[PDB]
Amino acid sequence: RRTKASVPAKRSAFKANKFGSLAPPDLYPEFGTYPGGGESPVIPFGSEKNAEREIIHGRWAMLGVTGAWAAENGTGIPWFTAGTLCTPDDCTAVADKFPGAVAPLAPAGSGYPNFWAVLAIEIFLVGSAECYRTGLFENPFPELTQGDVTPGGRFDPLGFAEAGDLEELKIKELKHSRLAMFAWLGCIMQALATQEGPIANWTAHVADPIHANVLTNAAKGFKFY
Template sequence: RWARLGCAGAWGAEVGTGINWFQAGAVCTPEDCTGIVFPGQVIPLAPEGSGFPQFYNVLAGTVILMGLSEAYRTGLTAPAFPELEVGDLHPGGEHFDPLNLAESPSFDFDRMKIAELKHARLAMLSWLGYMSQAVATNCDNPFGIGSETWPSYIEGAKGPYANWQDHVADPFVENVWKYTGLFQ
């Protein structure tokens, strides 16, 4: 589920703000975490000079909320609601099926569980593609060959949406072979 959310979030954030997923961390740093960029403009999260929200508070809140949601899902902690039992936090059931679609005679719940696993694996593969294209298309020295530092991103680096647009516009030029150095 996290891979699916990550792929959709990386794509949607780039479409909405123009900031690539691998450069989004530059918006909220320990030195300055007072605004977010939304379609080309900075929207303040707190009054200027107030020091809020502080980077480490945002980080701690995120870790706590994500940790709790995973703990409830896996059964490491008791469910938050008395009507839930460990194992209820899966697709289907009253919380994930508000329209009662699973009650339909034509609905095959076991098939849907398998489909969810397949979609999750595709999303993980998709995320690997996002990472690979970020390194291949945006780095001066993608693998750090001959240097002691991590790869550095080129100014104006392109994310998955921009690379997809380039590929759709000219699929015979903008493809994986362009960045391998083969067939040039």
């Protein structure tokens, strides 16, 4: 073994070309304001960390809302009962839940996602990433900063951040984040009140808009009065 240290000179498989900002110069005409650009309309700004906490809950709630949406669209199972499928016992069922899946997580027969297997992989993968994101563990990518919700190095392979206007993209993500978190809260409250999935509640509300509302179900007590 000798030291080569040649020039890689590799380019991204996709590298978004400069597209700039696709938003008006005004960036938060909506209620409230992005952090670091004005005063919080109602709730007090708890801490500098709260902005990054908002971003993380936002991205997680985006992913959760889209997961509940796609799971109910593809299987019809509500998200709040999808946990009962994969359990220490009979986690075989959870396998075939993806429409068009060429193959099952559980091949026919014994072959299957075990709860503990899935769980052990889940801890070892997600916790590792969670730690690497925060100050726990260490930084495997020194070029990026732990504790920054917008690293933008290897984590933007397409380079949309640099291709456009960075801060308008940031606020766009923030607005999507807040929208999805509020939608997630609506989904949990709907699950509590109606015991039916989000897309089921949507379908009931669009089939007969005038009925199948909060107040319609309240007339029946949300199945509790």
